[PDB]
Every structure is written in C-alpha cells, then in structure tokens.
A paper describes a structure:
The AldA•NAD+ and AldA•NAD+•IAA crystal structures define the position of the active site between the catalytic and cofactor binding domains. Unambiguous electron density in the AldA•NAD+ and AldA•NAD+•IAA crystal structures identifies the respective ligand binding sites. In the NAD+ binding site, the cofactor is bound in a hydrophobic tunnel. The adenine ring of NAD+ lies in an apolar region that provides multiple van der Waals contacts. The adenine ring also forms two hydrogen bonds between the hydroxyl group of Tyr255 and a water. The adenine-ribose rings provide extensive polar interactions with AldA. The 2’-hydroxyl hydrogen bonds with Lys191 and Glu194. Interactions with Ser193, Ser245, and Trp167 position the phosphate backbone in the binding site. The nicotinamide-ribose forms a bidentate interaction with Glu401 and the nicotinamide ring is bound by a water-mediated interaction with Thr243 and through a hydrogen bond from Glu267. Sequence comparisons show a conserved NAD+ binding site in AldA, AldB and AldC. These interactions place the nicotinamide ring in proximity to the invariant catalytic cysteine (Cys302 in AldA).
Numbering used by the authors:
A (entry chain A), B (entry chain B), C (entry chain B), D (entry chain A): 3 to 497
Write the structure that this text describes.
Amino acid sequence: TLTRADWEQRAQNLKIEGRAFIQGEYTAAASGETFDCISPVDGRLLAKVASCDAADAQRAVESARSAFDSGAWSRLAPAKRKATMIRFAGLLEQNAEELALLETLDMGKPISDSLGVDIPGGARALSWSGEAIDKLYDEVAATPHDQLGLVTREPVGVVAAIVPWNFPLMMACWKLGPALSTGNSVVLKPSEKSPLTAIRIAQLAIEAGIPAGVLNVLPGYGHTVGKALALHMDVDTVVFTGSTKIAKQLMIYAGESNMKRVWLEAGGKSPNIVFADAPDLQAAADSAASAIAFNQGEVCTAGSRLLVERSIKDRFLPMVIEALGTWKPGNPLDPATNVGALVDTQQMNTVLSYIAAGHTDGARLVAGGKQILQETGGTYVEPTIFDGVNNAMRIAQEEIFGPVLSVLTFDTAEEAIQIANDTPYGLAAAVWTANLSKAHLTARALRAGSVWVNQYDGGDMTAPFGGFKQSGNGRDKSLHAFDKYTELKSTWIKL
Amino acid sequence: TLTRADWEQRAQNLKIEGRAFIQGEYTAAASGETFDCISPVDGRLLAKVASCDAADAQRAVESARSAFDSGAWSRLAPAKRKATMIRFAGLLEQNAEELALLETLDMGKPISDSLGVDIPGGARALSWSGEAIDKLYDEVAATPHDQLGLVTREPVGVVAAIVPWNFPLMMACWKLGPALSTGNSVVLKPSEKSPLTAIRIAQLAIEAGIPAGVLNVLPGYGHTVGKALALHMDVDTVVFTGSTKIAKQLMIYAGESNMKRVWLEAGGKSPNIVFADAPDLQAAADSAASAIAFNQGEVCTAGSRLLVERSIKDRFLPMVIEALGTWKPGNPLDPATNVGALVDTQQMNTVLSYIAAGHTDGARLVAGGKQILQETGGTYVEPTIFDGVNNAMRIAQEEIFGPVLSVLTFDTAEEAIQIANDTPYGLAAAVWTANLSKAHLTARALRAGSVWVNQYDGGDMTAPFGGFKQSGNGRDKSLHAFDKYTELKSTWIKL
Amino acid sequence: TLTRADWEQRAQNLKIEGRAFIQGEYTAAASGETFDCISPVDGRLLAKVASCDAADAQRAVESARSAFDSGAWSRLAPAKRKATMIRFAGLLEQNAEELALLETLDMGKPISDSLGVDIPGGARALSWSGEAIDKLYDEVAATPHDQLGLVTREPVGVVAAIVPWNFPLMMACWKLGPALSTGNSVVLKPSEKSPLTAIRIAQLAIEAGIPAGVLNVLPGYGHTVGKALALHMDVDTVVFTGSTKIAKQLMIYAGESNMKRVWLEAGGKSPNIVFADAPDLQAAADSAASAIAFNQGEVCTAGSRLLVERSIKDRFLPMVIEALGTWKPGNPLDPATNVGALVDTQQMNTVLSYIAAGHTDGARLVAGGKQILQETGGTYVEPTIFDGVNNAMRIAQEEIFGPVLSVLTFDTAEEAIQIANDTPYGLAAAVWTANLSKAHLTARALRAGSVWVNQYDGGDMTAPFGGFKQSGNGRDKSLHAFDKYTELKSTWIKL
Amino acid sequence: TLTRADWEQRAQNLKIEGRAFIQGEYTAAASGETFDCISPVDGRLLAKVASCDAADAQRAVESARSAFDSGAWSRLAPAKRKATMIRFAGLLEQNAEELALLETLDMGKPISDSLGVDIPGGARALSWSGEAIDKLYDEVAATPHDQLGLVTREPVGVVAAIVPWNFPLMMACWKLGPALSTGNSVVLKPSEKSPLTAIRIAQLAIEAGIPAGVLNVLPGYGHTVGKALALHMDVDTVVFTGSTKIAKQLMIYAGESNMKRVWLEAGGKSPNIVFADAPDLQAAADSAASAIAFNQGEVCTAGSRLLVERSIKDRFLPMVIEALGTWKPGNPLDPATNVGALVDTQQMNTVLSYIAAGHTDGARLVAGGKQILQETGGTYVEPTIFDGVNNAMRIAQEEIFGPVLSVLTFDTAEEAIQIANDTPYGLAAAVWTANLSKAHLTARALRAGSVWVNQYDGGDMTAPFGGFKQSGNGRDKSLHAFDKYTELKSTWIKL
Ligand SMILES: NC(=O)c1ccc[n+]([C@@H]2O[C@H](COP(=O)([O-])OP(=O)(O)OC[C@H]3O[C@@H](n4cnc5c(N)ncnc54)[C@H](O)[C@@H]3O)[C@@H](O)[C@H]2O)c1
C-alpha cells in the first residue's frame, strides 16, 4: 500500500501525454493550439493539452468511418471482440496506479477513490460489456410457413461520446464498453477539465488489439470540438453525459444537422427518503452522509435532498451531522483522505454561491458552510447541511454539484412521494423502510431511473442507469446500454 | 359486395364529425376557428374541422395528465387493458365501412384499399398490441444474496402523436396500439389533410372503455397545434410520422423545451434490387410495379429506385412496364379502382415537377408521365417510369411521394449495394435472388430498417418497422414499439 | 342467476355424450366396452362411457400422427392458430352452463365453483395461450460474419395428455392451450372419474376450426388406455397431472418404450406460514380456511400444513376455526353451496382413514372430523382441523386430498423454513409477514414452484405453476408451458 | 511445437492420479478396490483407478448436499462465481499439455486433437458458462397494481453427471460449465474407459476456488456407481451423455427412486445431404470425409449416412474416397497423426462386426474395411466406406461409432428428407445447397437438434446441442443448457 510520500513522488515523476489521438497515432490539433491542464490539488501545471476544433472532428470522423467500413473491428468475430475488450480492461488494471494518479491530479478526487472505485469501475464496464457480446441473441419472428422473419441488431457506425469531468475514466468506459463491443467506431471527447485519462487509454486500446481508427480521442472545449461532433453530418449517434442545459443543445444540434440519434445522461436532484420504520437508522445516517460527501458531492445521483419522516427528524439529523463529520477534505494524494478538491475555481464559486443562496432563501445552516484549505493553492469546501428546507427553495430545486445537503420533512408517504417527484429531474431516488408494501409501492411511485431501497448508490453492471424526464434518455450499464449503439433490422424472406 | 353506386349513396348520406375531442367530449377549438376539409375525389366540402392551436394543446395535455395521474387507465390491470384494446379494435371493424369511406373521401385512396388494407391494418395494430400486454415480462438481475434487483418498465405519462395523411387511420393505430397498451395518455394530432378518421375513432375509444382524457384528438395545422404539442413542457414523449424536414424540427423543439423523448418515422427512397437469378421474374416485375403504384406512390417505403442487374435489364424492363399498365387511376369510390387520386393539387404539382426534373436531368421516359382525368375536378397522375437513371439525378436522390419509378442498372452485387446505400434515407430495401449466400449477405449489407427478400412490402405486426439514418429512429409494430412509450427503472433492494 | 331448481331441471334435461372421439368423430371403443359414469351428488347414472384400451390408443395416435404430418394445423400460420384457439375458448364460454353442470355432476364440486372458476379458468388457458403464439420470438446467435446461427422451436409432434378428476376441464385446458398453440396433435385421456367435459369439448374444438385428428379424446382407465399412451412408440411427449405414484410410473414407461419426453405435475403438501407480524390476521385466517376447504380440499396446492408462529397461535387458531365454519358441505346443484361432495366413496374412506390417523398419531381435533349428509346418498365430509401436529406425523407427511388441516407451530423463521421444506413435495407454499426482508428471504428459502406472499392461491396465466422435487417437473401456465411441447433446433448456415 | 519423441518422453514421465475425489481430497473407494486403466495406444498400464460403488455414491452425495446447503458456492455472488469459473477454465489451459496427454493415453485420440480441440473446447465451455452467469435475467410478470409477480430460477441442488469416453474432458465440461455456474454441487462419474482427466481436474477445481464438496469425482463402472447415483434418493437431477440404451435405463431409475430430473444426450445416425447444386463440391467432399473420420468416427454427430443426389453421385463419391484417404490411423503420440486408436478391443470388435454386417446385408465396400497396425499392441481400424446402401440395412439404421460411412442416393428433395428422417435418432443433420429456399425449407423439415448448412460440425458455445426423439432431451451449450440445472419459482406478492 503506497503512502502519501509515495504518491507525491510518483506525481512528480509522471510524464503526461497531452496530444489528441487519431488513426492509431497521437497528434497535435490541426491549429497547433493547446490549453493548460491545471491540477486542483495545488494548481500545478500538468500538461499542455491539444485544443481540437472542427477540423480535427472532421479528420477523426473520416478515420472512424473508414475503420468502420473496413470491417477490421465492425465485422470481427464476436468471440474475438470479447477477447479484445477483456484485454483492454486488463490493461486498465495493469496500469491502474498511473491512471488513478492522472485522475486525481486532473480533477482532484482522493487517490484512494481513484484507485479503489474509478479505475476498477472503468475496467469492469469494459470487460463486462465484452463478456456480454456473444451472450446476446437477436430474434426470429413467428411467421407463416413460407416466410422467415429475422429481427437483428447492427452497429450504427460512427459514435461520438461526450463525457464530463466528475468520473472521467469511468464515464468514458460506460460509453466505450457497449459502443466498442457492438462494433462501432467511437470518437471520444473528454471534458476540458479532465482530458488526461482519456488521452492515455487511447494507447492502451491499440495495445489491447483495437484497430487504428476505431477509437479516436479529441481533447478540447465543448463549444468547439464537442459542438463540431454533435453537428457532424457523418456521425450516426452522439452519447452524452453532462448538464441538462448542454444535453438539450445536443438535441437541437442533431435537428440542425443529420437527425443523428441522441442519448443523454444529465443532471439530478435525487431524493433520499427515510421513513420512521427504517430497519437501521445508523445505516441510513451513514449512507445519507456518504450520499452527499462522496466525490465532493460531484455525483449526478448525489442524495442532495434528504426527506425525513418528521417523527424521527430530531433524532436522525444529529446522526447525519455526526456521520458527515467523518468526511473531511484533505490532500487528494494522501491515501487517508476521503474528500478531495473541487474540480476548479469556477465550480467552487458556484458551490459557494449556492451555499449563499441557502442562507438567502431562509434555510438553516447546521453543518459546514465554508471554503477551506486556501493556503494549499487548491479548491476545497466543507461538506454542508441546510435544515428547514422547503422544496421550492433554490437549493432544493437546482443541482449544486457540491457537498451541499438539503433536509426536508414529511408526515405521510403520499407527501414524501409528492415532494420527491416535485422536480424536473428523475435520475435516482432512495427509500428506507422495513415494511414490505410501503417499500414496493413507494419505489413504484417514484419517477426515477434508479430506486434504491434500504441502501444508497446501489446496483452494479447488471443495473441500467439513467434518467426520467430532464435527467436524460436511455440507459448506461446492463445489456440495455447496447441498444444505444445499434439499429434494428427486419429481414423478411419469402421461401 | 358494395357497388360504386352503393358507395356514392353512402358518401352522400354520411354525417361527418369535425370537432376536436377532449376529456370525453367533442368540442370546438378555443378560438372557434375551423378549416375546410375538402375531398380530392371531386372537391366537395366534407366538414368544417376545428382548427386547434396552443390553447387547445394546453387543455388536452392537462386532461391527459389528470387522466394519467388518476390511474383509471395507467394503473388498470394488464388483462383489463388488453380486453379494452381488443374491444377498441373490434369497434373499428364493426364500423369499417364508415371509416373506410371517410378515409377515401378525406385523402383520395381507392375504397377497396381503405376497406381491405387500412381499416384491417389499423384494427390489427390495436388488437395485436392489446394481446401482447400481459405476454411481456420485465427483468430480475443476477445479484448477491442480500440484494433483489428489479428492472421494470413504466409508462412515460403523456404522449403526443403526430401523424401524416397517406395512411391516416393505420398510422394513428401504429402509435395508439402500443402507447395506449402501455398505459399512457395520448394526444393525437392528425394531418390537416386527413383529420376525419382520427376524429371519428375518438368516440369509438370511449365506447370500448378507454377512460375520458386518455385519448384526446386535436385536428389542426402542423405549425400551430402540432408545434404547440412538440414544445409543451408537460408532454413526456412525442412520436412522429411524416417528412424528414419536420422530423428534424421536432428534435429542435424538444431541445428548446423540456428534453422530451422524440421518436421519428420519416422519409424514404427505398431500393428494390433485382438480380438476374431472381427465382420468379414475373413475380419480381409484378411487385416492382405494385411497389411504386400502390396508394398512388404515396408510401414511405415505395420501391422508388429499381436496381436491375444489367444482364436481365432488357428482358425485365418491358415486364415492369406491362405490369405497371394494370395500375390505372380512377374514381376512388369505384371498388374496381386500384389507383386513386393524389391528396391535393399541391401534391400533384410536386409530382409533375419531379417528372419534369426527370426529363431535365437526362433520364428516359418509358411509361406514363402525365396528369389525367382533369375533367373530374380531381387530381390524378399516370404511374410513371424513367429508365437510364443515374443515382446522382434528382429523381434518384429525392423522395417524390408519387407514382414515379427510377430504373438504375448494376453489374455486380457490390455495385448494387453501393448504389442502394447511397442515400440519406434508410427505411426499406428489397433483394431478389435465388442464391442463399447472396440473399443473406446482401440483406446484411443494406442499411435499412426493413429488408425484404424475394418479395416487397413484407412483414406483419411481428416485424419492427422504422428507419436507419434520416429515415428516423425507433420502430413501429412488434414488441419493440412498446419501448418508445415506457421508461426503464432499476429498483435495487437491500435485504 | 339460476336457482337450485333451475340447475336441477337442467341436470335432468341434459343429453350426455359418452363416446370417445377420434379423427373428427365420436366413436365407441374398439371392444364396444363401456364403464358407468356415476354422479357423486346422489348416485344417478350420467352415461355409459367408452372404455378405451391399447387398440384405441393406437388408432388415436395414428390419427394424430397423420394430422400432424399433413400440416393442416402444425403448419397453419401463427395468426390463424391464434384466432382458432381464441374461438375455441369462446365456445367454452358460450357453452359454460352446460360444461359447468357436466363438471358438477361428474365429480361433485359446487355448481357456483364450476361456473365461476373452472370454466372461465379453462377458457382463459386456451385464449391466453392462443394470444401468445405470435408474441413469441426464437433466437439468432452472435456468430462470425460468414455464419448465420438460428435457434428455433418446433412442435414435438404427437402429445399424450393424461389428467385428473379434481379440476377436469381446467387441467385439460392447461395442457391443451400450449400444446395445441404450438401446433401439436394431442391425444387427451381424462380421468375415469371425470370423463364428461373432455368428451364434450372434443366437438367444440372441431367447431372452432381445429382440424380432424388434431385433438382426439380417449376416456377409459389409467391402467389400460393411459398406460398404452405412455408406452406408445410413436408418442413424442406425455404430459401428466395426477399422483406422484403414477407420475413415477410414467418415467418408467418412457424408459421402457421410446424415451418420450415426460412432464409431471404431481402431489403436494403445501405449507402456509403465518408470522406474528402478518399485516392482516383476519385475511390470513380467512385464506387459511379457504386454502383447505375450497374444492373439498381436493386441490394439489391445498394449504394442508398451517405453520403458525407460537406467539400468535392462541389468538390465530380460533380465527381459523371460525372462518372454516363458514365452509359447509351441501347440495352441489345449489348455487349457495360452497363445499360439495367428495368424488366417490373410495375418496371419502381415504379422508376418514386419515382423520383416524390424526387421532392415532396424537394430534388434537379442534374442528369437524366426521362424515355428514349420509341420507343424500352422496359423499360429504366436514372440513376438519387438527392442532398440536408434529411434522413427523402421517397427516403432516402424507397428502390427504380432503379438507383436513394440520396445524404446526414454530418460534423462529429458520424453524418455519426447516419444517416447510421437510417434505418430499414442493408444489406451493405461502408466507404471511409485513416485513420486507423476511418476506423475500423466506420466499427465497422455500423449495416450492409457487410461493405466495400475504395471500394464498395467487398467480394468473402469467405465473408458471409446477413442482420442485417429487411434486413434478416442468411448468403449466405462462410462456414457459410452451417449452414442454417444442424442441430446440440449431440451424448453423455457412454463407 | 512438441515432437513425437517429446510426447513419448512426457508420457513416460507422467505420474498419474487414480483416486476418487470427495470433499476436497483424493480418496480410495470404500472397498479399496481398483480397476486397471489400460492405454489403447499400445496396451500399457496407466494407473490403478478407484472402483467406486454405492457406498462411495452415498458419501459423495452427502458431501455434495452439505456443501450446497452451506451456501459456500450456491449463495456466492454471481460475479464471484463467474470469476472462479474463468480461473477454472484458465487452469485447464495452463495444464493443457498434461491434460491432453492424459486424454490421448487414456482413450487413444491423436495428441494434436486432444491439444487443439478437446482441452480448449473444455476450457471454453467452463469460461463461456462462467461469463454468462451475470448476463442472465429472470422475469417480472405483468400483474395488477397490488401484485408483484416474480419468476426466478434457483439451482436444483445436487447434480449427478454421467459422461462417456469419446470426449472425456470436453463432455464433462459441457455439464460442469452450466451446472457449477448456476450454483449446484456436482458428482461427476466419468466413463470407466476414460477416468483420468476427470480425476485430474478435481484438484484444479479446488485450486480455482471451487469449495470442497461442490465437485466430487467418482471413477468406476456404470452398473455400480453410475447406477447408484441414478437411483440415489437425494440426487435432484442426473445429466447423461452416452448410449440410447443406458439413457432409457436412467428414466427407469428415476421412476424407481425419487422422480429426479433426467436429461439425456444419446446416440445419433446423422444424415449428411449433398445436393447437386452444392456451392462447393470439394468442400462437401472434404467435410463428408472429416465427418466420419474425425476422432475415429467416435462422434455422436458423425455424418455416418451420406445422402447424395443421384446426378452427382458418380462424380462425388470418388472425391469422398480421395478425401478419406488423407485420414490415416497412426501413433496417437505423433503430432502428425490425424486418426488415432479406437478406445479398446471391445469397441474395435463391434466396429469390425458392423463392417461384416455391411457385406452381409449387401452393401458394396469401396474403401478401407480392415483392422490395421496390429503389431503396435493397439486397436486401429481403417476409415471405411460402403456404397449402394439402402436405409433399411443395419449399417444404415444402427449407430456404429467407428469410422464407417454409408452412402445412399436420392433424386428429389422430398425423398432426401424422408430418408434422412427415417431413424429413431435425431441428433444432427446437414444440407448442402446454394439455393435459398431449398436450404431453409429442407433444414426446417429435418427432425434433428442441429442442422448444418453448407458445412459440417458447425456451431460454437452459442449453439444449443442435443437430440430429437431417441437422441435425447434437453440441450448442452448456449444459455439453454443452464435450464437443466435450475428450477422455476413463481413468487406472487400481494401489496
Ligand atoms: N450518469 C449521469 O447522468 C451523469 C454522470 C456524471 C455527471 N453528470 C452531469 O454532468 C454535469 C457536470 O459535468 P460538466 O460540467 O462537464 O457538464 P457540461 O454539460 O458542462 O459538459 C459535459 C461535456 O459536454 C461538453 N460540452 C460543453 N458544451 C458543449 C457544447 N456546446 N456542445 C457539445 N459538447 C459540449 C463538455 O466539454 C464536456 O465534455 C452535471 O450536470 C452532472 O449531473 C451526469
């Protein structure tokens, strides 16, 4: 087990690749332009990263298209694609320490989280998806004797994947797993706030046996190369994870261009409903704190609204405060740290402004509330709780994407459901109760893509993940994720 | 069997409903405005139809939402929804003669087609979908012993369905069958060129037991009430059948509003590939003619590009010409008629302009090419064939939506495939060959949602139907149609 | 609603068919022999029924085989088979009053049960199965590009169905629905204790459009014609519902003959577990009584072992006694009657012998325990309860097939599960508890084909039904029932 | 690449384990008795192998049952069972040279086949099955609002697997893959003619992480320990691969004991149908020879009946003779050898007696026909062809299980199908034709579990494998194999 000093030495000794990757080779952007990749750990310069634009999108898509048409990957035997995807996952694990360190330096999450959650999670999405390839069957319809009706799935062709900065490698892998497994070529566009691991795994893909052109990586800004990919007339599908605002703009881009398929994973304001008859209130308290403090609250499914049955509120809230007190910001390179830096100054100022809005709209600060560790040259905020929140308050309605918890009360299950569903979002929700009927009926009534019962942040690769309403469309993970990267064909044969 | 005189008597004796339908009652538009519904068979006034706008969209959506929330239909037992949908289908059949007559008068297709194809096809979509409801199973994941992982589907809520004029009732039913079967409320917006059957079946739905508010019908223009539904902030999903141009606009509307799900069935320029080793050339010739002449060529999957192997071209083209000669425009109310009127003057001018374009771009007219029966006051054009067509010509690239055939030649299977896929569209295609390998390998290479082998216009309710590329996204018919009207939920329960 | 006098008039006015049915015609047995069909309601002669033997089995199998080979039904379009099966179900309903009367007279169940449960249940099995036919899809494997791998299902051919007397029509339909829907020819052998409804519906099948030879019916004894079918070298599959003893004998017959597939639905000793935290004790008490008294306890899944948590036992047992008191034997032709006659004298003696065994082995009689209504000439026994039962006692280990309840106690969930699973059987079980974890974990631990939670006798046509262990193999109802009547084929095509 | 001399040295240097394996340890049989394991390569003594009997079956099943009930494997997380199964497969590959050598020495197949087909094939069944575990989903029925209907699968408990000698390790793995993956305990009973690899992999299972008691191995005779397992009252399921005669006896044993589930893979007499319009006659000739000579014709799906369209017979048969001449018996330890020894003297004498019967019944010997290489001390027979065979001849009806081909002619497709289906068997069949319709219609009409088109011996792990009629019931490989090792449960929960 590596120490803080070990990680600090390794961080200093990294040579960091900043180039784009197109047709099997690292490359500068056509313009030669770069942007500074700055670490939120302490503000050090990590790398000058290629700043791609429309011209680079064009070259990457031409490369993607040529590779798809060659059939080198798209017509490779399923069992062979499986083997390659599993080797790809294996190379992530083999290079786990470097990749984890890049993630931590790039966007500030604790090294123990990068190493323990992100890298294994990314690898698992690649290998599980790979494992599934030849376990999938298409269909033969019930037809008259002189007909053979086949209903099959084929890869769409060229896929653009635009991903965010909060789980850079893992979110990339949630897309790459099913998209590559089904045989598509993918152009990956990582967040400008976290380009490094995406850039690095482009090389690993080649080493695993992914052909040149099949996985191209274009670092750069959303409003330049991201937009260019979404408007491209020869991209078949764009998959996206990010804000609801940008997600909507992608639907507009598709409409303005070639009617490409658009699949979105967007914001959340997930309600964590704790009933008086929860089987384990301490577990509910620990989980409620973890739900908002894990990864600095920079989680789409953060349990940012805590709904507590009023009769246990006075006992439960102090339990949640004490649990939250164990989540402490610190040096992300220290293995003992469980809360890291926020991704940058821009994000931190947004979070601080929402904390200010909590005060303004009349909520009661009961824990945290301040920026800390300023002397480090990094960006850190205390996990924060507001009590006495009404669901119409800004901190109840709007996604904060920091470790800021809103606490609301209710007195009936029906009110809990009404409050929980009172949102434009619908990514996740949780219910804590020992009652059989109340558990299933409440879960059934919540309009959310994931509903966790007597736990938070549940599910694994077998569980589809995605939004109701403005939290998105379509699902990541599970076999259902494959459907975003394929087209149905009905082949009706007269005999 | 009814005679022409019988159908003319019946046409005269219809009382035709023109009002919108909201919350279980026929109603004027809020503005009181109407538009004239004129028959293309000769020009008579059928009815003054309510011209709905945004205010009516709002009232209909409020009705739909309230109905959905009440659970009267959305939480009705699956077996009971099945019985209702089957009764709904049964009422279409019970009233087939009236509905077919309305269809024929409304948009000009032959009465024998309305009676023999449209009404049975529509009824079948409703009954088959109903039958399927309790044959569908959701999923239980493989999880650790202390977890129960449920993956289920739930109705999205409020669905707007916007449909075209070429198969008014049948297309409405393709949407209504699965949308209603899954438990949604639906707001149906029929084409302003063909509002009458949708208006009529609103009452039949009530009679079958569909609760008030669950199926609302808003006749009116695309740019008024259609647009209002697509921009509405409380519509969860819009499903669409129509032009690629408008389909794209709907993606923009969704992005501008509430990120509603958008499912599109759009245009086509389907290739009909006849190899020299086709098993039955006469069958191929008969189907090639039917593929362009049926429903006046106003068919999304019309075989508008006939690709013929050069070595049989001289023999096959005269066969296609002779077969096309049996398709003759005539009085739509005559049961002997197999080709009806074009939907309106605007449509006839478009077809005539494309025939002119055929000449201009250098193709050779070998059949038809002219308006006929002007004395009737109706709009009729001869089924038309151009030979010597290059795929770059306008008549080869652009959807005409009239009975105009382009004939192209090829020398190799590779060439046929390249030409076939050389289109922004991808709705359907056909292959004619007696060879096992060539049939399957060519079918596999064609980028289209339906591929018919040794037949044209194949499939039934078991066959998903929809586009690759700019022909749309998602599928109508089959069980896959249901997925457009539901959301996946992952319920992970800690035990 | 018909009165007792009405049903008695109708009983007198029946003309009852007693012949076998082969190749579209009613027929005597080859030997000319008959057996007396006597009613347990009072002892009248209903009909002299053909007593078939091996010669008749041979002729029926030859008819079945020829019909199968002709394709009249086996290669009939799926949608047409669906329509026929639905018409078949519709004829059962059209003739419900006659069929229910035949059932009640034949084996003694109350007329209100025959009319309200048996005939609708049978019709439902036929129509639901029919509806499902064209909703089923076979499979296409993930293969290399030069391979097409089809995995399809085909009817086995000739199916023998051997059924019992407790639900004569409904059990026959549980087999016929999926066996006929998949395209097989079926030879049905009803119990010699209840031949009449099977004989009758043979004609209804013809009327619905089932071709001659596809459904043959051979009334007669198990050891003659039943055995002949099970040993027949040209029967592909036998499906069976009856005793575990005979079920085992069928496996031996298959091994002695042609290795035909054997699917068994056999005996049961189902445990009904009521925890102290059951949500509704009165509902639990009412269901516990119904579970043993319904259809005279002549139910494979009768809740014959009531397991009660010791801490509610003193409160719950009087509730069960009072609820059982509402179940009173009476004239089966009286519509007010909720408990009918036992099927014959042999059955009554068996029940009385087990009541004697209850006393001998040391249990405590707390309700019923005696034959009643001897003056009627019929066979009736009081619903009976023994308290203080140990699971090692004969009444706890052996299936009684009468209305005799054994009451056992437990202190822990672990104990309840151990007792519940302490049986050679495994057909059904029930759990009553308001606790989420306990309900799912206990249901998971129970080795039984059906587990009902907070209800008894649950499920519908969507729920597969069948045994663990010596309660049988394979499942009736649901789509899984179809798999007993088809064979998988892997067609791997090199392209 | 190892030479013949290398393999001869390795064979001499093996230390061979002969003991049974129970509860994590090698053990003598209770009696202390052994049988001589003799090599058909040259007659050398390989090992004295434990000769288990009823007492050993009892101890193994008690061990299996205790392990299943402990949940160490049966309740282990799916993802963890997957990982263990993949490591298990990995250890087969890691020890491939030893395992391949054991197989070759034990039952005589060429070392290049053992190394290239058997070991990789066995490993692949284990890992593919393992990979599938968490890709499988169970079901949630469509039910009323106050019901939750779960349809799930659970392991049956204790599985007996009885396997033959022709593919000892691979057939064992076809059973072990799905049986262990679903969580069962397995008692494996290898053929007394080939016990060695089964004995050896028992240790590898433990090293991979399979808990003690979960995989027990009992070498010994069929009529002692095999029979004891099939009659055991606490074995839930027996799966079998072997002769039809013994397969039938297992059905009888189940009936005599506890009604255990019985799944059989039995004999074959597979027809290889070559039409005049086969796309590649040379390929058909090569494959027809391989179909009968591979693994000494000791293959269940050996293409033992060659049906050739009469018009190509005179040209085709010499092609088949020339191809068959490339398959030459030789030293199984020589890597160049492509035909090995027959398993023993008993088998060889059976084969020679069938060759004698070919002469007697009037067939024409056109190739091979004699025992060879007698001086080696081993058992070898020339690949043999009889022409002018009629389907009623013994060599056409009966399974020979040696390299003996029967050649038949036909003149119509209909006759080809009649002849092909004229058998009590139905394991596999093949069709060679370039015609689309004839390929699919003929394949559809053949009553066989596998149908190969324009190839022989096709399919991989995605293709279910097993018999129609007396070739067995149920399927090995694919996801369908899992169903033999699990039970369906319907859990209906009232809410
Ligand atoms: N599974 C999920 O649903 C999921 C997971 C993690 C994070 N998120 C969401 O991500 C957001 C935080 O991430 P973010 O700040 O990177 O979001 P963002 O919307 O600002 O950007 C996401 C990605 O889109 C790109 N982008 C920005 N503008 C673009 C444009 N005009 N056209 C094309 N691409 C453009 C960015 O460069 C980045 O790669 C939150 O709203 C959070 O809820 C969702």
